[PDB]
Amino acid sequence: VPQELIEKIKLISPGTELRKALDDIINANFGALIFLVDDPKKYEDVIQGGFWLDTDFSAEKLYELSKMDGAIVLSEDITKIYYANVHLVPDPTIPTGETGTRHRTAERLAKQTGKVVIAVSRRRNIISLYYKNYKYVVNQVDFLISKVTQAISTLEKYKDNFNKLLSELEVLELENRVTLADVVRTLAKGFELLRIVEEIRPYIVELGEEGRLARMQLRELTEDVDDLLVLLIMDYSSEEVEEETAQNILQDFITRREPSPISISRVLGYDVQQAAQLDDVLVSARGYRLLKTVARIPLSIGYNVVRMFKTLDQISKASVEDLKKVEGIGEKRARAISESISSLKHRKT
Amino acid sequence: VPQELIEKIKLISPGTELRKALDDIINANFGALIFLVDDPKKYEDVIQGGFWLDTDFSAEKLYELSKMDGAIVLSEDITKIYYANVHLVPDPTIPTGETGTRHRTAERLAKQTGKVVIAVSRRRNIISLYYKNYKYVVNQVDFLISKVTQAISTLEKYKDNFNKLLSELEVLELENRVTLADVVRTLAKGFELLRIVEEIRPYIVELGEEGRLARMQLRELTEDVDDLLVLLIMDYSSEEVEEETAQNILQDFITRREPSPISISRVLGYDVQQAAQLDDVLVSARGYRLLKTVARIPLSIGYNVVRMFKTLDQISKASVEDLKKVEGIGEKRARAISESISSLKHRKT
């Protein structure tokens, strides 16, 4: 959805004065045809009759004016009401796939002028926004909340399964018994979880102010998921991979590519044919995930540790003395690494 | 009202199936916009979307189709329904003094194509017919009947005073005591009476089949008034005058010229400037009225009788033998003339 169009959508999103007025118009079953222009004098060819108002905008004024037949003309920033009860006359030759005089008029005028035109039928509760060659149907909050609440509840389920796969993989990592199947399975669920987030995003935006709690819920649920997926990619990719490259891997599986077993294993650098082979491939974590998230060791410094010990397994066997031989690790970071790992092994395994 | 428009108005007059449908539409508060054209193909630029029907017309079909939004397209003779639910798009630059999309659309389309377009709003009970640059509002029968009934009542009153004036003029005429004032007063009342008929005529025409009784009443009330007035003009005009000149005099006072005492006397060939003078001008009827109406003597032959005697007074002093000295008058005409005058003088004076 183009950004130039997303900007216009904000104009009638829950929270704005304009939307408050449109909600009331809908509740009263009045119809509405609103034309947003900047220079009223320049549309004497498409705007006919009505009353010249040139007054300050307000939700109550718009509502009251919508009681009359015809269209209302507002300024682009919704600060002035220019005309009311006007007859809009766009070029009849302009193609339109709309039905009815009001919507056909709205699409034609928007295409002809490159301006925003809002239409509301008397019987229905949707707001149709036309801008240039675009058409966006805005829904009432109740419909949006139902979809968003369902999506969140769905996300909770995926997240619960992600957490179980993660704790299981954690045990396998600490014991160095991880297979490519385990890794890919965890990444797959992580990619599916973030995809759901991406798909509900437009619903959230459209909710405007009414989407505050929904946003907070999405944040609490998916907080550090992205980072976690990036660290897993770095820890299990066939060959050393830069963080940015890992983040790009993530972005691709979250939008373009499809998170299938073989496909994920393929992008990780493993030449696998059948998904049954995944259980056959053994892999050892580099150690980034634990070093950063648990030992609180910056990636730039974690590279150094991996460069020397190569795997988490070796890192877990290294003494403080051993660890201090690494650039960037003093008695403090050496203790943190050593202690955080020995603590997890004892508690988890 | 041009004969051209008059023909179209008949299409929606009480009695037609079309009008029957429009009345139902009005009674149901549905709206309507109807475009009459014989070759739809040629107007495909002003007719958009909708449903192609091409079916035989019926009042029930038109009524049902009017439940949908948009416009209906019928053949000019109203025998076929071509489209329903269409969007009519006439040129926006066409000037119009109408209000609302529906009526502004109808006027522009009518001007643009030179055809008939019918508009009916849901809120009102009138039918607006637009043809070319003409606009005729058709009213419901109830409104028309009320106007027509009051006009008829008014005519009865004028006719009564007319008969009172005529009866008194009859006495004076027989006694040869007529003054210009007597004649003028009678003519003025007769002229005023016929003007009312002319003014109410359009209402009766617009009443269609529901105006049958009204036409009968008008005819019974004004049956022989025109002839009577023409004969009065011929009998009292300054100098001899033909039936054609008289008939023209009548038409002038019923439309163009105002029937004022001085104006009537002036047109009769009398030089007067004050109404008071009228009671000072003694006049004598030629005899045409009595010869034609009572003696049943053809005007052509009446000219001969007046040629010889000049006035009714002299005609009543003639004998059968004397009267027969006129060409066209035999013992029969002579008897009818002589006996009819003598009988009236005995009964009226």
Ligand SMILES: Nc1ncnc2c1ncn2[C@@H]1O[C@@H]2COP(=O)(O)O[C@H]3[C@@H](O)[C@H](n4cnc5c(N)ncnc54)O[C@@H]3COP(=O)(O)O[C@H]2[C@H]1O
């Ligand atoms: N060119 C045309 N072709 C076919 N039918 C025509 C027509 N123009 C008017 N009408 C018929 O008249 C109905 C009501 O017209 P109205 O102006 O009261 O009530 C209108 C008007 O206030 C508004 N509206 C529609 N088009 C407009 C325009 N171009 N400019 C300003 N207001 C418009 O939306 C209301 C409802 O529109 P809707 O079509 O549902 O309802 C229409 C339609 O069935």
